[PDB]
Amino acid sequence: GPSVFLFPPKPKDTLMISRTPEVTCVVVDVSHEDPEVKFNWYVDGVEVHNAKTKPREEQYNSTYRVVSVLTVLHQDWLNGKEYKCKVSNKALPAPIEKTISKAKGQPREPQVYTLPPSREEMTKNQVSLTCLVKGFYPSDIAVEWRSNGQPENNYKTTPPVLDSDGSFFLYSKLTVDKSRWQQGNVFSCSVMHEALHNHYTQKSLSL
Amino acid sequence: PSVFLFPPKPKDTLMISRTPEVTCVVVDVSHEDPEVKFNWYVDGVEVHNAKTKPREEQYNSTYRVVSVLTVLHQDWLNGKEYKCKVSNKALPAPIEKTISKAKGQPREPQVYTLPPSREEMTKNQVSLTCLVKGFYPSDIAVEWRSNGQPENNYKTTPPVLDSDGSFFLYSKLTVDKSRWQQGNVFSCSVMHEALHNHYTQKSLSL
Amino acid sequence: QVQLQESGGGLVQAGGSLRLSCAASPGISRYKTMGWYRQAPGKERSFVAAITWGGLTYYADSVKGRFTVSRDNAKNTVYLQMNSLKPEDTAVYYCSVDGGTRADPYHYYWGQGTQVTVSS
Amino acid sequence: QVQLQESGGGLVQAGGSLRLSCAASPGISRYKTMGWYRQAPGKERSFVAAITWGGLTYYADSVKGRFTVSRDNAKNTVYLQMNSLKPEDTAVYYCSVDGGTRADPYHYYWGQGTQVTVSS
Ligand SMILES: *[C@@H]1O[C@H](CO)[C@@H](O[C@@H]2O[C@H](CO)[C@@H](O[C@@H]3O[C@H](CO[C@H]4O[C@H](CO)[C@@H](O)[C@H](O)[C@@H]4O[C@@H]4O[C@H](CO)[C@@H](O)[C@H](O)[C@H]4NC(C)=O)[C@@H](O)[C@H](O[C@H]4O[C@H](CO)[C@@H](O)[C@H](O)[C@@H]4O[C@@H]4O[C@H](CO)[C@@H](O)[C@H](O)[C@H]4NC(C)=O)[C@@H]3O)[C@H](O)[C@H]2NC(C)=O)[C@H](O)[C@H]1NC(C)=O
Ligand SMILES: *[C@@H]1O[C@H](CO)[C@@H](O[C@@H]2O[C@H](CO)[C@@H](O[C@@H]3O[C@H](CO[C@H]4O[C@H](CO)[C@@H](O)[C@H](O)[C@@H]4O[C@@H]4O[C@H](CO)[C@@H](O)[C@H](O)[C@H]4NC(C)=O)[C@@H](O)[C@H](O[C@H]4O[C@H](CO)[C@@H](O)[C@H](O)[C@@H]4O[C@@H]4O[C@H](CO)[C@@H](O)[C@H](O)[C@H]4NC(C)=O)[C@@H]3O)[C@H](O)[C@H]2NC(C)=O)[C@H](O)[C@H]1NC(C)=O
């Protein structure tokens, strides 16, 4: 039987006013004898109609996959607003309804610390610049690296992990060429999360 | 029915004092066909040493059966490659799953310890950081040690894929700032197959 | 269509007993978990009990030891036996056909609800 | 009580052509995707082509441009047209009924296999 999955917006989309948060309803395992499927949407049990359904898209396994995208008037998701996707199909006895909302509970602010490379690491041609982001909730976050204001490309970030206190932390490692680090270049870790003032913060880091 | 094959735990394959297991989980076994049968292959030679637990009903009223096979520890380290075959009368042909250690030149970890940033001591608890980077394959184990007794209150990120094809992770130890200030020596200990004696420690104190 | 028609509600004083039962339309409950949920005014609907097709039972801590869920698989009806009823147990009780996990369930169908109120 | 019977293999010299065909039992292929796989002596089975019931085709890069998979849904038969054959194309060729993902397929039925040899 056909199955339904409901996906949240991306953290960045809800944090920037310059970006469109979307909620996505995916129907897989749609069969060939009855291609047609509903989409009906509810933000808090009141029916909306702003949703965009794409045409059904055949798959390797010879089942269909249908996607419906609802764009959220950004402040709603960010407010704990609750979103419901409901799908029925001639191959379904009764419709399937799935619900999604922002993680429920008290937002806790992240804490941003930058760490110089270890004194050993300078025997290497590239040193690691570290940003520790800890104490935050919910897990949704965005972290980027910047130098002189302009972006920085050569960084990687861990997935959010659960600390024993019930909150999350991650680390961000930016790899720079040791010369760039030693010449007194100032590097900057930038983190976005809803519990921050202005939804935003930096911490700087230099020799 | 769906089938999932899980590797042994890194620790267990790294220390001789521990036994590595390979685990085959079958979910969505229905009540019309409670029967599930398992075939195991160590590099295409069928084995029969495996332990099947009796099936155990789940909250959703499907069954879940798990079969556990034990590895001649060096075998997982020697890249022996494992195949689970699941037969069930609701499936026309079996489901077969395979798993092994990542192949390619093993690269040694590089272990750096980092003091907490000072903006952090406004807290009663400060974080001590261990960067393990440059390692390959991803199977690894990290612990925190002080005075020989372990440290319980640490967390470690999953290994992340770096651009050069090697892995890194971080390990965070939380101690009471009083502990950090008294000159207590804290120890980051990592095990990984490219290390000498499969082992190295890296210590750090104010 | 599928129905889940419940019965046996009413009023009892504290420490009494009552047997809720909930009949399923044919087929719909077969091989699936049947659960009980109850809702007090000013609170959410909340979990009470559930029994798998194979007879495994799960209880909310609030009610362990005092309620007993059971099932007649052949007639498509599930039962909740309430003992040591305390004033906190006042609510509408809805029966369900359930999937997913115990910590994170999925609710296929709901019955239309019975009131059970225990006066002090 | 044969399912998936392939036919039309044989021997061909380099640059020649051959049309493999595979007839399915009634029912087993309907609404399901059919694939071709080949196994050379000294190597394991590997993917060649597949066509979904709605007519979407997939190829390994080894044979893209050179092989053409096609399907007569009403006859329950799938065809593989091999053109400009080169000596690697020698192998046992199997047709399948497939599910799952391209990267991780699941094989409902297998044909019994036909040998295809491409001379110098
Ligand atoms: C009825 O109720 C059942 C139980 O209540 C429920 O069973 C659940 O079924 C789902 C699948 O439907 C299954 O999900 C899989 O879980 C994999 C990880 O399971 C781990 O970790 C989870 C927590 O994340 C635990 O819940 C599990 O118990 C299991 O724990 C591990 O157990 C072993 C054995 O003891 C230990 O050694 C481990 O240490 C321990 N670790 C942890 C962390 O718990 C998950 O990885 C699977 O994902 C893969 O498939 C997905 C698609 O379904 C992909 O999105 C995803 O990327 C993965 O793809 C895989 O990637 C691998 C690496 O690249 C490849 O090698 C694989 O080939 C590839 N698989 C593919 C492509 O298919 C997967 O989501 C649950 O684990 C299972 N729960 C339990 C308890 O068994 C039934 O679904 C319910 N059914 C119904 C109808 O209601
Ligand atoms: C035919 O071929 C089809 C196409 O390949 C195939 O469709 C696939 O079907 C499987 C299961 O039937 C489905 O698996 C689910 O995947 C969930 C995550 O999907 C993401 O990410 C994967 C990669 O991991 C991608 O492959 C998916 O496309 C999807 O991508 C996302 O898409 C959205 C919208 O486009 C994007 O915005 C996202 O960014 C993007 N993410 C990416 C790319 O990473 C996975 O989470 C599901 O697991 C959950 O349910 C399981 C039970 O079914 C549990 O075991 C498991 O623990 C998870 O539980 C959920 O946990 C939540 C908490 O976080 C709870 O809130 C939920 O209630 C709980 N759900 C439960 C319990 O049901 C699940 O594994 C594939 O995604 C899907 N692929 C595609 C491309 O559609 C068909 O299966 C094939 N059919 C046949 C017959 O062969």
Does the distance separating the beta carbons of D106 and B95 come in below 8 Å? yes
Q: Which of B44, B9, B40, B38 is nearest to B26 (CA)?
A: B38
DSSP state of B77: H
Nearest CA to ligand 2 atom 17: A5
Say which ligand is closest to the CA of B96: 1
Segments forming the whole domain that contains residue D26: 5-118
Residue D60, Cβ neighbours under 10 Å: how many? Answer: 15
Is A74 assigned a ligand-binding role in the annotation? yes
Q: Which residues in D lie closer than 8 A to residue B92 (C-beta atoms)?
A: 108-109
* Torsion angles phi and psi, residue A13, rounded to 5: -65, -40
Q: Which atom of ligand 1 is the closest one to the Cα of C101? A: 5
Q: What is the CATH number of the domain that holds C58?
A: 2.60.40.10
Provide the 3-class DSSP secondary structure of residue D3.
coil
Whether residues B4 and B38 share a domain: the answer is yes
Is B44 an 8 Å CB contact of chain D?
A: no
Domain span at A180: 102-207
C20 near C6, Cβ under 8 Å? yes
Which residues face C21 on adjacent strands? C7, C79
Based on the domain organization, do B105 and B148 belong to the same domain?
Answer: yes
The answer to whether B73 is annotated as binding is yes
User: Which residues sit with their C-beta closer than 6 Å to ligand 1?
Assistant: B 2, 4, 6, 23, 25, 27-28, 58-60, 62, 64; C 99-101; D 104
Facing A132 at nearest CB: one of B127, B156, B160:
B127
For tokens 């609907």, name the residue: C45
Cis ω before B106 (30° cut-off from 0):
no
Q: Looking at the structure, tell me whether residues B83 and B107 fall in a common domain.
A: no
Q: Which residues in chain B are contacts of D106 at CB distance < 8 A?
A: 95
B59 and C100 within 8 Å at the Cβ level: the answer is: yes
Minimum CA distance residue for ligand 1 atom 76: B27
Rounded distance from Cα D26 to ligand 1 centre (Å): 35
Q: How far is CA B71 from CA A165, B39, B86, D81, in A?
A: 36, 15, 19, 46
What's the number of domains chain D is made of?
Answer: 1
Closest CA to A182 of A126, A131, A144: A126
CB B188 within 8 A of CB B202: yes
Residues B152 and B128 in one domain: yes
Burial of A28 (0-12, 13-18, 19+ CB in 10 A): middle
Q: What are phi and psi of A159, to 5 degrees?
A: -70, 150
CA atoms within 13 A on the CB side of C76: 13
Considering B73, B100, B127, which residue would you say is the last residue of a domain?
B100
Q: Are residues B9 and B46 in the same domain?
A: yes
Residue in chain D nearest B93 by alpha carbon: D108
Is B1 within 8 Å of B91 (Cβ atoms)?
yes
- D61 with D54: CB under 8 angstroms? no
Half-sphere exposure in the Cβ direction for B201 (13 Å, CA): 11
Same domain, A10 and A63: yes
Long-range CB pairs of C102-109 (<8 Å, 24+ gap) are: C102/B59, C102/C50, C102/C58, C105/B59, C105/C35, C105/C47, C108/A94, C108/C28, C108/C32, C109/A94, C109/C2, C109/C4, C109/C28
CB within 8 Å of A132: residues ≥ 6 apart: A111, A112, A113, A114, A115, A169, A171, B117, B127, B129, B172
Q: Which chains touch B (3 or more CB pairs under 8 A)?
A: A, C, D
Is residue A49 part of an annotated ligand binding site?
no
**Alpha-carbon gap: B66 to the closest alpha carbon of chain D (Å):** 21
Q: C101 touching B, CB under 8 A?
A: yes
Chains C and D are touching, with contact defined as 3 or more CB–CB pairs separated by less than 8 Å? no
Ligand located closest to B100 CA? 1
- Method of elucidation: X-ray
Both structure tokens of D3: 């399912």
In this structure, what token pair is assigned to residue A100? 């999604």
Using a 10 angstrom Cβ sphere, with 0-12 exposed, 13-18 middle and 19 or more buried, the burial of residue B169 is buried
B48 is in an annotated binding site: no
Question: Hey, what are A92's tokens?
Answer: 């379904």
Given resolution (angstroms):
2.6
| A47 and A72 inside one domain | yes
The full DSSP string for B149-166 is EE-SSEEEPPPEE-TTS-
**Lookup: tokens for B172:** 């965070």
* Structural domain ending residue among the three candidates B100, B121, B144: B100
Q: Same domain, yes or no, for B63 and B121?
A: no
> A128 and A81, same structural domain?
no
Is residue B180 located within the same domain as residue B79?
A: no
Q: Is B93 on the interface with D (CB under 8 A)?
A: yes
**Amino acid at site A99:** T
Residue numbers in C near A93 (CB within 8 A)? 2, 28
> Which atom from ligand 1 is nearest to the alpha carbon of C102?
5
Q: Is A31 within 8 Å of chain D by CB?
A: yes
Tell me how far apart the alpha carbons of residues B150 and B154 are, in angstroms, rounded to a whole number. 10
The tally of domains found in chain B comes to 2
Domain boundary (A46, A72, A101) is at A101
Domain check: are A80 and A118 in the same one? no
The full DSSP string for B78-107 is TT--EEEEEEETTSSS-EEEEE-PPPS--B
Q: Which ligand is nearest to the CA of B5?
A: 1
- How far is the C-alpha of A114 from the C-alpha of A172, rounded, in Å? 9
- Same domain, yes or no, for A127 and A207? yes
The shortest C-alpha distance from B117 to chain A (Å) reads 6
Tell me, in angstroms, the distance from the centre of ligand 1 to residue B4's CA.
Answer: 6
User: For residue A88, which of A46, A47, A42, A36 has the smallest C-alpha distance?
Assistant: A36
Q: What is the amino acid identity at position C111?
A: G
Residue C61, C-beta contacts closer than 8 angstroms, at least 6 positions apart: none
